[PDB]
Design a protein around this nucleic acid. Sequence first.
DNA 1: CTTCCTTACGTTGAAG
DNA 2: GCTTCAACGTAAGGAA
Length: 112
Amino acid sequence: PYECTLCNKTFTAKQNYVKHMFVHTGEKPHQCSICWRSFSLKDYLIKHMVTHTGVRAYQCSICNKRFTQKSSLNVHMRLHRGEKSYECYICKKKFSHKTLLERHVALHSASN
DNA sequence: CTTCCTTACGTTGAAG
DNA sequence: GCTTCAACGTAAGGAA
Ligand SMILES: [Zn+2]
Ligand SMILES: [Zn+2]
Ligand SMILES: [Zn+2]
Ligand SMILES: [Zn+2]
């Protein structure tokens, strides 16, 4: 029900509406006391502080590799699921089409 | 190729 | 019940 006069965007709650209008003001009052960069919202600065501490709190449950963020970990999860590959049950090689495995399995048949 | 690092939205749930 | 408002979640996309 909340709309931005400028960029014309609707928000569900008032919190994101109030924050969005402050970002428009360009003001950045949340400063990192290590590198002295400023940020418009505190939640942004909280994420920036990881670049100094080096903590990697977001660990994948599969390969156990840790990341600086959850967005970085979310996109990493798109790699543990991908296109399947057929497997010759003799030489254990992989193939990308069934008609390719049938032509290869038929090779093991002719010679033996 | 991945990952870092930035921003922008969202709902949930203590706490007045 | 009605307001925050912090702590998360989702995602995008150039930089490293
Ligand atoms: Zn706007
Ligand atoms: Zn800093
Ligand atoms: Zn993983
Ligand atoms: Zn084979």
